[PDB]
Amino acid sequence: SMVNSFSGYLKLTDNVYIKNADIVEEAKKVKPTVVVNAADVYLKHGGGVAGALNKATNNAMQVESDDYIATNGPLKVGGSCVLSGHNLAKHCLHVVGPNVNKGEDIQLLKSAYENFNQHEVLLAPLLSAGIFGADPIHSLRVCVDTVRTNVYLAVFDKNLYDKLVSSFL
Description:
Layout: E1 10-11, E2 16-20, H1 23-30, E3 34-38, H2 48-56, H3 60-72, E4 80-84, E5 91-95, H4 108-114, E6 121-124, H5 136-146, E7 150-155, H6 158-166
Parallel strand pairs: 2-7, 3-5, 6-7
Antiparallel strand pairs: 1-2, 4-5
Helix pairs in contact: 4-5
Domain Macro: 3-169
Organism: Severe acute respiratory syndrome coronavirus 2 (2019-nCoV)
Subunit structure: May form homohexamers. Interacts with N protein.
């Protein structure tokens, strides 16, 4: 593959890389073609990764998202849409992983990650992790086993990052 500016990542596989990083700061530094948001079906970017990305855009992501929903209606769990990356990236791929706290089927996590294959290179969080309630170790395994394009994963929490690395091989 071609050289890129992602720095300090651990290589997990041929195509998956991981770093302990704040995805907002990593996006601002790299300006990737695609940053992935951990979205919900209504594109209400209140907290977690989505709240942080939206805050970094000064709420422009939310304003754009509200128009998207008014025109198109809610996403599907496992689905996605491409919107602007604002000051973070060229594009933001809003991907809806299942929310385990709401009882959503974890099998939809694979469908969610399949959206990444439509983009050659992405900066992304672990889908369904954090406030969405899934096990991040499982999310990483589904990512590795589903995504074939080049994905740079940013893990907010250092302790979790170390556990994801140590349990991987």
